[PDB]
Amino acid sequence: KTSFGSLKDEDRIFTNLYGRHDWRLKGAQSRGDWYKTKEILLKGPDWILGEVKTSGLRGRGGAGFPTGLKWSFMNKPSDGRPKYLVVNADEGEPGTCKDREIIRHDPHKLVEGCLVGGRAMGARAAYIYIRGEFYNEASNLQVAIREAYEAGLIGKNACGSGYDFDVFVVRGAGAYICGEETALIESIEGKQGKPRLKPPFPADVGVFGCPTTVANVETVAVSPTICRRGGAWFASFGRERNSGTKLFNISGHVNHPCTVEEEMSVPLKELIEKHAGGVIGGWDNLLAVIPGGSSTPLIPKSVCETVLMDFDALVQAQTGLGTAAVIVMDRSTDIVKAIARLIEFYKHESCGQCTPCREGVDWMNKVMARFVKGDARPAEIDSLWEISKQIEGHTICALGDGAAWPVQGLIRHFRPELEERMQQFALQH
C-alpha cells in the first residue's frame, strides 16, 4: 500500500464515536465490543502483548513509544508489590478532544481494553484518571463500569476467565500537568501533580509505589479490537512504523471542525479537506497548521501542502503527530498572538517544580507578549530561540520542551512577521 487515508467504516475501531448509537453495554456488544473477552484473557498475557507488537501500536498519547514494548516492560515476575495499570484520561493538550469522545460514547470499549491490558501485564486493578471537568463523561464511564461489574465482565472471575480485575475512576481537579504520566501517578497518590524524575521508571515504581503502566485512552481502547481482528489488521493501515488508525481532532479555522477516525499516514491536506470541508476561505487562505495538539511545532502551508499525518513524516517536518489535534490557522490569524496564547497556557499550567520550566516558561511568555505588541528588537528573537533551547532537554517533564517547541516553530517559520511587527511598532513611536 502506497496511498493511505482511505479508511472504511468496516475498519473503524470506534463505531459509536459520534454517539449515534447506544453507549451502554447493549450497544457496545451489538457493535462487537466485549466479544469473547474470556478467550482473549485466557489466550495469555504474552499472546496479547505479541498481538499488540504485531499491530505496531504506538503511543496515542503523543509520545509515540511502541505500545507493545511499553506494556511488555511490566510482563515480569511479580516483585511482591501489587501491580497496577493507569489509563490516562486527562486529555489536557489544547486541541485534543478525542479521549473525551471515546469515554463518553464508547466507555465499554475502554473498559474491555483495561481488562485485556491488565491481563496482559498482570495488573491487580486499573485506575482511570479522568479530567475533573469531564464530569458527565466520568458519570458515563462509571455507569459502564457498574454494568460490567453486574454482568461479570469485570471484577472477580472477570468474563468467567478467573482473572480478578477492577476498574477505578479517579476524577482530576483541573491541572494540565496531570496529563504527564508520573504527575498523574502523584496526583492519584494524593500529592501535588508534580512529575517524578525517571529513573525509577513507572514500570518499576509507579502508583502507590507499585509497578504501574500509564496508557492513553485510545491506546487502551484499541487493544481489544487489535486482539480480535488480529495485529495484521491494525498493521495493514498506515505505513511501516506508523501503522494503525488515529483519531484526528481537526479544529480551528476549518469549515467543519470535527473528530474523525482516519488511517495513519494520511495526507494532511486530504484529511483537512476530506472531512473538515477544507480551510475556511479555501486552501490558499491557510496560514499554518499545528498537527499535534499544541506541543508539536507548527508547519507552514508550504510543508502542509504535501505531508503525511504520521509520526515519522511529521518528525521530518520538524513537528510530530502527537495527539493528532490539527489546529488550522487561516491567514486572518495573528500567528504571534496564537503562539503567545499557547505559551500563556503553558505558563498557567506549569507545575513550577523544575527551575527551567518554572522561570523560563514565564520569561518566554513575557517576551512573546512583547513580540505580539512588537515592543522588542530583532536580536531578541535569537535570544528567545536560545531561551527555548535552554528550557528544552533540561526539564523534569516534557511540558517545558512542549512549550519551547511552539516558540521554535514560530521563529523558524514566521520570523519575518515578528521583525516586521517590531519595525511597525518602532515607526509608531
Partner 1 sequence: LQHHEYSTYTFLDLNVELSKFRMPQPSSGRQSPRH
Partner 2 sequence: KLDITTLTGVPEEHIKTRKVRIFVPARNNMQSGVNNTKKWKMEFDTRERWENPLMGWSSTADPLSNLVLTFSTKEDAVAFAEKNGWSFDVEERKVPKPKSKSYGANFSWNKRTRVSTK
Partner 3 sequence: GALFVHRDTPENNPDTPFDFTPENYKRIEAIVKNYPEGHKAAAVLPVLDLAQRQNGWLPISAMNKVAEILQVPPMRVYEVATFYTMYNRKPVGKYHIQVCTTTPCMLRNSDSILEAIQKKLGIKVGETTPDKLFTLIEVECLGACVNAPMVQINDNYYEDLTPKDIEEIIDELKAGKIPKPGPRSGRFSCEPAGGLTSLTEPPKGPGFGVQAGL
Q: Write out the binding residues for ligand SF4, residues 140-199 only, by CB under 6 A.
A: 177, 195
Chain positions 292 to 331 lying near partner 1, rule: CB under 8 A, are none
Instruction: Please list the alpha-helical segments (H only) found in 134-267.
Output: 135-151, 181-189, 217-229, 231-236
**How many residues of this chain bind ligand SF4 (CB under 6 A)?**
14
**How many residues of this chain bind partner 2 (CB under 8 A)?**
16
Say which entry of ligand FMN, partner 3, ligand SF4, none residue 208 contacts (CB below 5 to 8 A, set by partner kind). Answer: partner 3
Structure letter (DSSP) for residue 216: E
Q: Which of 45, 62, 193, 206 binds ligand FMN (CB under 6 A)?
A: 62
CB atoms within 10 A of CB 135: 11
Q: Is 419 in the site for partner 2 (CB under 8 A)?
A: no
Q: Are 410 and 298 in contact (CB under 8 A)?
A: yes
Q: Which is nearer to ligand FMN, 40 or 403 (CB)?
A: 403
Binding mask of the shown chain, residues 339 to 358, with x at each position contacting ligand SF4 by CB under 6 A: -----------xxxxx--xx
Helix (H, G, I), strand (E, B) or coil at 167: strand
Whether the CA torsion 268, 347, 405, 421 is positive or negative: it is: positive
Q: Which is nearer to ligand FMN, 267 or 293 (CB)?
A: 293
Q: Is 358 in the site for partner 2 (CB under 8 A)?
A: no
The span from the CA of 51 to the CA of 171, in Å, is: 31
Among the listed residues 287, 300, 290, 250, the one whose alpha carbon sits nearest the alpha carbon of residue 270: 250
Cell digits for 91? 486529555
Say which entry of ligand SF4, partner 3, partner 1, none residue 233 contacts (CB below 5 to 8 A, set by partner kind). Answer: partner 3
Say which entry of partner 2, partner 1, ligand FMN, none residue 59 contacts (CB below 5 to 8 A, set by partner kind). Answer: ligand FMN
The span from the CA of 129 to the CA of 301, in Å, is: 37
At residue 323, what are phi and psi to the nearest 5 degrees?
Answer: -95, 5
Say which entry of partner 2, ligand SF4, partner 1, none residue 269 contacts (CB below 5 to 8 A, set by partner kind). Answer: none
The span from the CA of 91 to the CA of 325, in Å, is: 11
Is 91 marked within a binding site? yes
What is the rounded (10 degree) CA torsion for 364, 392, 350, 69? 150
Is 227 marked within a binding site? no
Chain positions 168 to 207 lying near partner 2, rule: CB under 8 A, are 186, 189, 191-192, 194, 196-197, 199-200, 204-205
Radius of gyration (Cα) for the chain, nearest Å? 22
Q: Are 185 and 170 in contact (CB under 8 A)?
A: no
Structure letter (DSSP) for residue 356: I
CB atoms within 10 A of CB 164: 13
Q: Which of 35, 47, 73, 149 binds partner 1 (CB under 8 A)?
A: 149
Is 365 marked within a binding site? no
Is 65 marked within a binding site? yes
Strand 242-243 relative to strand 258-263: parallel, antiparallel, unpaired?
unpaired
Binding mask of the shown chain, residues 174 to 203, with x at each position contacting partner 1 by CB under 8 A: ------------------------------
Helix (H, G, I), strand (E, B) or coil at 152: coil
Q: Which of 33, 112, 166, 180 binds ligand FMN (CB under 6 A)?
A: 180
Q: Are 121 and 82 in contact (CB under 8 A)?
A: no
Q: Which stretch binds ligand SF4 (CB under 6 A): 160-168, 285-293, 362-370, 391-399?
A: 391-399
Q: Is 91 in the site for ligand FMN (CB under 6 A)?
A: yes
Q: Is 215 in the site for ligand FMN (CB under 6 A)?
A: yes
Q: Which stretch binds ligand SF4 (CB under 6 A): 5-13, 288-296, 336-344, 390-398?
A: 390-398
Q: Which is nearer to partner 3, 187 or 243 (CB)?
A: 187
Q: Least distance to partner 1 from the beta carbon of 137, Å?
A: 8
Q: Rule CB under 6 A: which residues touch ligand FMN?
A: 59-63, 65, 70, 88, 90-93, 177, 179-181, 214-216, 219, 397-399, 402
